[PDB]
Design an enzyme around this catalytic site. Structure first.
Site, short mmCIF file in Angstrom:
data_model
loop_
_atom_site.label_atom_id
_atom_site.label_comp_id
_atom_site.label_asym_id
_atom_site.label_seq_id
_atom_site.Cartn_x
_atom_site.Cartn_y
_atom_site.Cartn_z
N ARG B 23 27.90 -19.61 -108.15
CA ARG B 23 29.41 -19.43 -107.83
C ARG B 23 29.94 -20.95 -108.16
O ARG B 23 30.87 -21.02 -109.03
CB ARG B 23 29.71 -19.26 -106.48
CG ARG B 23 29.24 -18.17 -105.50
CD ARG B 23 29.66 -18.17 -104.17
NE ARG B 23 28.96 -19.51 -103.40
CZ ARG B 23 29.88 -20.49 -103.31
NH1 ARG B 23 31.21 -20.47 -103.48
NH2 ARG B 23 29.38 -21.52 -102.63
N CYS B 198 24.24 -15.98 -94.19
CA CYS B 198 22.74 -16.25 -94.74
C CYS B 198 21.57 -15.57 -94.25
O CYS B 198 20.57 -15.08 -94.64
CB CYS B 198 22.89 -17.68 -95.00
SG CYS B 198 24.13 -18.20 -95.94
N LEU B 260 17.68 -26.07 -104.68
CA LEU B 260 18.05 -27.40 -104.76
C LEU B 260 19.06 -27.74 -105.52
O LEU B 260 19.17 -27.04 -106.52
CB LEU B 260 16.88 -28.19 -104.92
CG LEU B 260 16.07 -29.37 -104.31
CD1 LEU B 260 14.59 -29.09 -104.46
CD2 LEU B 260 16.65 -30.41 -104.15
N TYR B 261 20.30 -28.48 -104.95
CA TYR B 261 21.28 -28.47 -106.00
C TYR B 261 21.10 -29.38 -106.99
O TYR B 261 20.63 -30.53 -106.43
CB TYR B 261 22.73 -28.68 -105.33
CG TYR B 261 23.15 -27.51 -105.12
CD1 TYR B 261 23.76 -26.38 -105.99
CD2 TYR B 261 23.52 -27.16 -103.61
CE1 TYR B 261 24.38 -25.52 -105.52
CE2 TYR B 261 23.90 -25.90 -103.32
CZ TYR B 261 24.33 -25.15 -104.37
OH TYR B 261 24.89 -23.59 -103.69
N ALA B 315 27.99 -29.75 -102.50
CA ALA B 315 28.23 -29.73 -104.05
C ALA B 315 29.40 -28.31 -103.97
O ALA B 315 29.95 -28.50 -105.18
CB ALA B 315 26.93 -28.92 -104.47
#
Ligand SMILES: O=c1ccn([C@H]2C[C@H](O)[C@@H](COP(=O)(O)O)O2)c(=O)[nH]1
Ligand SMILES: O=c1ccn([C@H]2C[C@H](O)[C@@H](COP(=O)(O)O)O2)c(=O)[nH]1
Lengths: 316, 316
Positions: B23, B198, B260-261, B315
């Site tokens: 997104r 979530c 993991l970003y 992020a």
């Protein structure tokens, strides 16, 4: 070989199941928390070590995919997994004018005369159902089962939502959504409920061109129940992808209570001496596409070579 | 040591995360399908390799346990995880008479003047909220968040159900139920929803005197998100047991998309050079019992010795 995570899940319960008692005062050797996965592009995980019949999974899943809550489609389709819970309602409601049958189910595979009479009281029910439409309408509609859980989630603002189908559009239009989930648990209803559903939830995920799906099952019967559930959700995962022009990837099966029933530790041990033979393939006929339009001719399986079948007392 | 399944889940994404876009047009190294478990009777899995603050998890979970959808309890409690989504509504609705702020969030940790002004436009919001009750009532009530998902599942027959609490009575009265599940996914609402939740689902299971719980998280941030979620559901698992006079057993954490970003692969690598120190203990004060009556003084942690903290750009 594709079904090794299964014998491997069976092993381990035997070997570290602590006894859990259960609703039906039979026993369970149980574990909690297991996740296992199957790479659907190496074959189709219909077990080779214990015949499981796929015409039965096919009519069955497809009923769900049509919205349907009625056993007529099923009886027409020679299926009766579902039979006994509509019967259940029948055999009470004012019109059950006939005999014993109330209870059936136990006094059935452990006595009296109930084997015969009852199987007939069922059939008669099933023959009225497959023609007397007024009857079919009021005693063969199970009301709240996967087909309307998935396609007619009764809202609170008097209407119906088509979760599954809705979700299948998000796959086409944005396939990288961390949230394609269809739920089949309704907290309003599990109080008033017969078997509140097992496959509580599922999620898809596409990545690199492949669709995957994960199932969460709140309760699982390693001998009798899981053989067939692994095949419902793998077929679903094949089904949703051929509609979105997607290449298949893997099925993951999570389990809250996974358990083996006490009357099953011999029969399990029987398949355990066996050796997996190469897993079959699927062919899903190319021309057709609204997955809601598949019909049992459109899904065919290739080269299925299983070990002969094993018998179980249903325990419940 | 108790948190090794976590570094172990971090490792593996790095090392087999295929890139997934997302997104927020940042990157994810991603996997799908992971289950990991923690034996809550050897310690408390608050990470030792990266300070995580537990006063923040405590106020936070407890808000959920009270039914509450209002940020006042939180601000009073020095908490602001939740801050920014009520702000969000504010800063539009007719009364936002003031300035820029619309967007904040990005133009904030990557520019302009937005750092300051905006942090003040937030605070002012938060000070009106913590006293002007008419305001608090209409701009600090987030409406649909875990606290009412769990204790006021809006039915379709005009009412509220108390899932969690309802479930806690089935634990007392029949602890071997294969079906103690609290859901927090409502298909009617995830359309009209801000972050659809979530932790989609959870289940308890008691056996041999111990309660266990399993969480299913449809989406997970290995650096920033998971450190804290493992602690919310372990505290919940400690909480529900001390109320039913139950001895603790283990927490299992399942994940659909675990990822993991991209702006986190350095920071992760930092904790990865570290060594677990022995995990802390919990003390949950003996006298009190309606879990809905716990208050932050009643839950204390012993001997927490972590590595200093690491920084991340959020992020998203
Ligand atoms: O699709 C199905 C339906 C039922 N069961 C099993 C799960 C439990 O063994 C039992 C249901 O009992 P409860 O879980 O509802 O208590 O039937 C399955 O394995 N798969
Ligand atoms: O309790 C929380 C809340 C959010 N996230 C993360 C999950 C995703 O990285 C992102 C939510 O994006 P979607 O999954 O909704 O697309 O925030 C968590 O890890 N834990």
């Amino acid at each position: 070989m594709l079904e090794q995570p299964y014998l491997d899940l069976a092993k381990k319960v035997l070997d570290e199941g602590h006894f859990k008692p259960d609703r039906t005062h039979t026993g369970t050797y149980s574990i909690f928390g297991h996740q296992m996965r199957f790479d659907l592009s190496k074959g189709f995980p219909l077990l080779t070590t214990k015949k499981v019949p796929f015409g039965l999974i096919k009519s069955d899943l497809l009923w769900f995919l049509h919205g349907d809550t009625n056993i007529r489609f099923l009886l027409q389709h020679r299926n009766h997994i579902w039979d006994e819970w509509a019967f259940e309602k029948w055999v009470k409601s004012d019109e059950y004018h006939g005999p014993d049958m109330t209870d059936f189910g136990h006094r059935s595979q452990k006595a009296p005369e109930f084997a015969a009479v009852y199987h007939e009281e069922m059939a008669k029910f099933d023959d009225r159902v497959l023609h007397d439409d007024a009857f079919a309408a009021k005693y063969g509609d199970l009301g709240l089962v996967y087909g309307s859980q998935w396609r007619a989630w009764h809202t609170s603002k008097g209407d119906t939502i088509d979760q599954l189908g809705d979700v299948i559009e998000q796959i086409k239009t944005h396939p990288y959504s961390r949230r394609l989930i269809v739920s089949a648990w309704n907290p309003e209803d599990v109080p008033t409920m017969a078997l509140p559903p097992c496959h509580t939830l599922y999620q898809f995920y596409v990545n690199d061109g492949k669709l995957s799906l994960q199932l969460y099952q709140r309760s699982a019967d390693i001998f009798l129940g899981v053989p067939f559930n692994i095949a419902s959700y793998a077929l679903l995962t094949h089904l949703v992808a051929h509609e979105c022009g997607l290449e298949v990837g893997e099925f993951i099966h999570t389990f809250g209570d996974a358990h083996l029933y006490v009357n099953h530790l011999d029969q399990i041990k029987e398949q355990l001496s066996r050796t997996p033979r190469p897993a079959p393939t699927l062919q899903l006929n190319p021309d057709k596409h609204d997955i809601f339009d598949f019909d049992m001719k459109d899904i065919k399986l290739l080269n299925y070579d299983p070990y002969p079948a094993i018998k179980a007392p249903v325990a419940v």
